[PDB]
Amino acid sequence: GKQLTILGSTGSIGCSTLDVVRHNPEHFRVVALVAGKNVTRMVEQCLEFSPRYAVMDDEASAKLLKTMLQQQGSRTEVLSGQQAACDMAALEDVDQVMAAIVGAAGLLPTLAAIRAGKTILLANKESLVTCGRLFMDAVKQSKAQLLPVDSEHNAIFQSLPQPIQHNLGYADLEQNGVVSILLTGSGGPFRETPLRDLATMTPDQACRHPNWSMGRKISVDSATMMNKGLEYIEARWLFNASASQMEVLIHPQSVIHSMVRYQDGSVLAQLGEPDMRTPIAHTMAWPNRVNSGVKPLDFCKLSALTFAAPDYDRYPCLKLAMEAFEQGQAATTALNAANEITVAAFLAQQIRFTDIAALNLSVLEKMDMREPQCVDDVLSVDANAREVARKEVMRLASSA
Amino acid sequence: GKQLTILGSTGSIGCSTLDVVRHNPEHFRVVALVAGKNVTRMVEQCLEFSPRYAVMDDEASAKLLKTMLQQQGSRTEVLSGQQAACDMAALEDVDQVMAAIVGAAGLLPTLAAIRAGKTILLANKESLVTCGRLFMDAVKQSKAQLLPVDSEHNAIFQSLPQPIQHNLGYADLEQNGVVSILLTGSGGPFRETPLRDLATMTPDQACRHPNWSMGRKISVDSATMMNKGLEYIEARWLFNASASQMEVLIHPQSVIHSMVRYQDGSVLAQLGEPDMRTPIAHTMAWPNRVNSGVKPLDFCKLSALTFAAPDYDRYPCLKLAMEAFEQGQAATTALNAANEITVAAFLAQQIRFTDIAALNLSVLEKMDMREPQCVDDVLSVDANAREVARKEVMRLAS
Numbered sequence: 001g002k003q004l005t006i007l008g009s010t011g012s013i014g015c016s017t018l019d020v021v022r023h024n025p026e027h028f029r030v031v032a033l034v035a036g037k038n039v040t041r042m043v044e045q046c047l048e049f050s051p052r053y054a055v056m057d058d059e060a061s062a063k064l065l066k067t068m069l070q071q072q073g074s075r076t077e078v079l080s081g082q083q084a085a086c087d088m089a090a091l092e093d094v095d096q097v098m099a100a101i102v103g104a105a106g107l108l109p110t111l112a113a114i115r116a117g118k119t120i121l122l123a124n125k126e127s128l129v130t131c132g133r134l135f136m137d138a139v140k141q142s143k144a145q146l147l148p149v150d151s152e153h154n155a156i157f158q159s160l161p162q163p164i165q166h167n168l169g170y171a172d173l174e175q176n177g178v179v180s181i182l183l184t185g186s187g188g189p190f191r192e193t194p195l196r197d198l199a200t201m202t203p204d205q206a207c208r209h210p211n212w213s214m215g216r217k218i219s220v221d222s223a224t225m226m227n228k229g230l231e232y233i234e235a236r237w238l239f240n241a242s243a244s245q246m247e248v249l250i251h252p253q254s255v256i257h258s259m260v261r262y263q264d265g266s267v268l269a270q271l272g273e274p275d276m277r278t279p280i281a282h283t284m285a286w287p288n289r290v291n292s293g294v295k296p297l298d299f300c301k302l303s304a305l306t307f308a309a310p311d312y313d314r315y316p317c318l319k320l321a322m323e324a325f326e327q328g329q330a331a332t333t334a335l336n337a338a339n340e341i342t343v344a345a346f347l348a349q350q351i352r353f354t355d356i357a358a359l360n361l362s363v364l365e366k367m368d369m370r371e372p373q374c375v376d377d378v379l380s381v382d383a384n385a386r387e388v389a390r391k392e393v394m395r396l397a398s399s400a
Numbered sequence: 401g402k403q404l405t406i407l408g409s410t411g412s413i414g415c416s417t418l419d420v421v422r423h424n425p426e427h428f429r430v431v432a433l434v435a436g437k438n439v440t441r442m443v444e445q446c447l448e449f450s451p452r453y454a455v456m457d458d459e460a461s462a463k464l465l466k467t468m469l470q471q472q473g474s475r476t477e478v479l480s481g482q483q484a485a486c487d488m489a490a491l492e493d494v495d496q497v498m499a500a501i502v503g504a505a506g507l508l509p510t511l512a513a514i515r516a517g518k519t520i521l522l523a524n525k526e527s528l529v530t531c532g533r534l535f536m537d538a539v540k541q542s543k544a545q546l547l548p549v550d551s552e553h554n555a556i557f558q559s560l561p562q563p564i565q566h567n568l569g570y571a572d573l574e575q576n577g578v579v580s581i582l583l584t585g586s587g588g589p590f591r592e593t594p595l596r597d598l599a600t601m602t603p604d605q606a607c608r609h610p611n612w613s614m615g616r617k618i619s620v621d622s623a624t625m626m627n628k629g630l631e632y633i634e635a636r637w638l639f640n641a642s643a644s645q646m647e648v649l650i651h652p653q654s655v656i657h658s659m660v661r662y663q664d665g666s667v668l669a670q671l672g673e674p675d676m677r678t679p680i681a682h683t684m685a686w687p688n689r690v691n692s693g694v695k696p697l698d699f700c701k702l703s704a705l706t707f708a709a710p711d712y713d714r715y716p717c718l719k720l721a722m723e724a725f726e727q728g729q730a731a732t733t734a735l736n737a738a739n740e741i742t743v744a745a746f747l748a749q750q751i752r753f754t755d756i757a758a759l760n761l762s763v764l765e766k767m768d769m770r771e772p773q774c775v776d777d778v779l780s781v782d783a784n785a786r787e788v789a790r791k792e793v794m795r796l797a798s
């Protein structure tokens with residue numbers, strides 16, 4: 001029975017990983033659940049999995065759950081604050097920690113797990129996008145095992161040889177016969193759209209997606225391919241890949257989740273349904289397998305699988321992400337931050353769809369790059385890029 | 401560097417194997433080459449790879465090869481005969497044996513390599529199709545390492561977990577998270593041909609294929625999908641898979657070479673160009689990799705990838721192979737033997753394309769022999785199946 005702490009349990013990934021536990025009760029034991037304010041969900045999960053501890057980052061939210069679970073006859077101890085969240089990730093008896101908390105938060109909670117040398121089911125982008133170098137140095141030193149939950153990175157992991165999986169980010173690709181990592185993406189809803197028309201696309205149009213049913217922020221990132229840009233930054237740190245060892249491909253049907261090109265010409269790939277329980281269950285059971293409740297892929301009910309090379313004129317955000325990587329963590333962190341601001345501004349109809357790539361670029365052009373030396377430095381670059389971006393949005397919505 | 405013995409060196413697989421070592425001279429050393437009658441090719445291979453021994457099946461070929469090499473100043477020791485071929489497969493110093501001798505001829509040499517506990521680069525169908533249980537038991541005994549060279553079996557191997565790769569054939573699939581083995585095939589040239597027209601298809605039409613570079617016999621097997629039927633039989637033995645754990649899928653483009661379905665829903669697959677150097681190099685380097693000379697698969701220059709379920713009314717040989725497996729090695733051995741006869745008959749225009757499956761079935765219905773218990777027993781079933789097949793062909797042509 002693997003002991004696990006779930007960081008961000010009430011979210012989509014959180015509830016999904018919990019469903020995998022349901023399907024395999026004798027395989028996993030929930031030791032701790034961590035969340036933000038969604039007391040309701042927390043209550044249900046605690047009542048179902050009898051966690052030893054439960055924490056909410058919000059003091060108030062924590063008080064309600066504190067008593068709500070008291071009366072419910074629950075014997076789970078309720079705590080609160082980041083400090084507590086971080087302790088849950090470092091519990092002596094916990095084997096794995098699902099790091100599903102997003103944004104700047106979750107950075108310290110995930111780092112806490114890495115420093116405790118635990119197995120980390122990496123389900124957040126912030127870690128590698130903003131602290132790529134710092135986190136990979138920490139995992140190497142603390143000997144923690146990273147197991148990527150993100151569909152693409154997970155497909156890549158499953159398609160890699162054992163020696164790289166066990167020394168992720170440290171092992172050399174070439175020495176292990178890998179020539180490159182093939183990062184795949186759908187290309188979004190504007191894959192065919194004339195370039196001239198991108199500037200007038202609306203939020204509803206941008207958030208139009210077939211495959212995965214993600215939120216609006218991620219749907220837009222998929223339309224600009226900033227999402228793939230961020231996964232590119234992540235992949236290089238995670239798999240120890242140079243620019244020439246990375247290949248980005250458009251695969252509209254999203255059946256293949258990503259692949260790995262080898263020395264003898266072999267290309268290994270992972271295919272599946274657009275259901276996160278698969279990659280989640282894979283990381284949870286690794287190196288073994290477990291039922292995830294996901295229905296088997298029916299090859300007789302598929303659209304023809306196609307591929308294409310992305311055009312940077314169409315996806316400038318993709319190229320921006322690639323360039324930001326060469327500039328360091330300050331750059332990628334700033335790009336990520338600006339993008340959060342611009343996508344939100346676009347969604348609020350304050351700027352055009354094409355203003356996202358334009359403002360993201362402009363923010364990076366004005367930032368004073370100073371490579372962070374710890375997460376606190378990273379957080380400062382984030383806050384600073386976030387402010388620079390808000391002003392560009394206001395400057396654009398006002399007069400400029 | 402690894403020392404190898406190449407069984408069937410002058411053939412297609414053998415030449416592809418030698419190209420792989422040619423690309424990695426410091427990784428492999430050719431210690432012994434074995435062939436049949438192509439003295440010409442054997443001489444050039446001996447001259448380039450400096451093997452310790454060179455073995456020809458035919459004694460006359462051996463003698464001719466011997467005079468060729470001396471005239472060229474080569475000191476390669478020349479031998480001849482089956483026993484000699486077996487000795488090459490068991491040399492104490494050799495690490496790997498590329499089992500590429502086709503047909504009944506490859507049986508003893510391959511078994512000799514297995515008995516010697518060598519790492520076997522299995523590139524012949526005769527072995528598992530006719531001596532499935534016998535050979536798989538032989539492997540567990542000597543604890544020899546099997547590495548499938550067949551494109552599909554190789555693709556499946558690469559998409560399997562390590563505990564199965566080692567312990568190939570005896571490890572449990574469910575235990576290791578495997579739901580099923582997805583065996584893919586192109587469906588051949590008559591994939592969309594009206595069923596009514598199949599009876600009139602010509603050897604030339606049947607042998608068309610933008611696919612791989614195969615002989616006419618294998619070409620025909622791809623149009624009847626008897627090839628896939630044979631791979632179904634092998635895969636069952638090789639991966640310790642039951643009927644429910646096997647899925648056969650038509651994939652016209654042949655970019656995906658086969659796949660493996662897992663419990664969490666993941667499906668792992670191997671893709672690549674239609675070049676045997678890739679899987680051969682995979683087996684030779686396992687668990688590492690080496691350049692094979694195969695160009696990288698360009699995803700931007702591909703036809704859309706499609707899949708379909710095999711229609712048995714169109715591919716009766718495929719259903720026939722599946723049913724024969726249930727019966728035993730006598731049935732699979734007989735089916736394989738009969739098919740060689742009927743396909744040759746079709747190529748010589750003695751029978752029609754659709755008669756291949758009809759006569760294959762007829763032979764299995766007439767025989768009903770007993771479960772063989774050694775190589776001589778299967779060789780006997782093969783012999784009998786062939787004569788029954790020849791009589792079927794003859795009474796049909798008259």
Ligand SMILES: NC(=O)C1=CN([C@@H]2O[C@H](COP(=O)(O)OP(=O)(O)OC[C@H]3O[C@@H](n4cnc5c(N)ncnc54)[C@H](OP(=O)(O)O)[C@@H]3O)[C@@H](O)[C@H]2O)C=CC1
Nearest residue numbers: 008010011012013035036037038057102105123124125150
């Ligand atoms: N969704 C997907 O399929 C995938 C997502 N990812 C990455 O996973 C992440 C977001 O995933 P998604 O998880 O599904 O989420 P939401 O569905 O966004 O879940 C966020 C969770 O973390 C908790 N949370 C937020 N802030 C804090 C904080 N300060 N302290 C503690 N808990 C906090 C909140 O719970 P509460 O609601 O109670 O506030 C909530 O459970 C990002 O890192 C994303 O880029 C990667 C691959 C696939």
Ligand SMILES: NC(=O)C1=CN([C@@H]2O[C@H](COP(=O)(O)OP(=O)(O)OC[C@H]3O[C@@H](n4cnc5c(N)ncnc54)[C@H](OP(=O)(O)O)[C@@H]3O)[C@@H](O)[C@H]2O)C=CC1
Nearest residue numbers: 408410411412413435436437438501502505523524525550
């Ligand atoms: N081609 C492919 O991509 C694949 C083929 N296979 C399997 O590979 C096999 C045959 O392959 P292919 O190799 O290309 O062949 P040919 O190109 O048919 O090679 C046959 C070889 O073995 C030698 N040979 C024949 N009879 C004997 C004998 N009695 N003793 C010693 N050597 C003998 C003959 O050489 P010589 O010509 O000198 O007589 C020749 O080198 C079959 O077992 C087939 O089903 C499996 C997967 C992929």
Ligand SMILES: O=CN(O)CCCP(=O)(O)O
Nearest residue numbers: 150151152185186187222
């Ligand atoms: O983990 C899932 N994704 O990244 C999918 C979201 C957009 P894409 O299909 O273009 O990669």
Ligand SMILES: O=CN(O)CCCP(=O)(O)O
Nearest residue numbers: 551585586587588622627
């Ligand atoms: O090892 C390779 N093959 O079997 C490919 C031959 C073409 P087919 O799969 O359609 O029979």
Ligand SMILES: [Mg+2]
Nearest residue numbers: 150151152231
């Ligand atoms: Mg993703």
Ligand SMILES: [Mg+2]
Nearest residue numbers: 550551552631
């Ligand atoms: Mg084959």
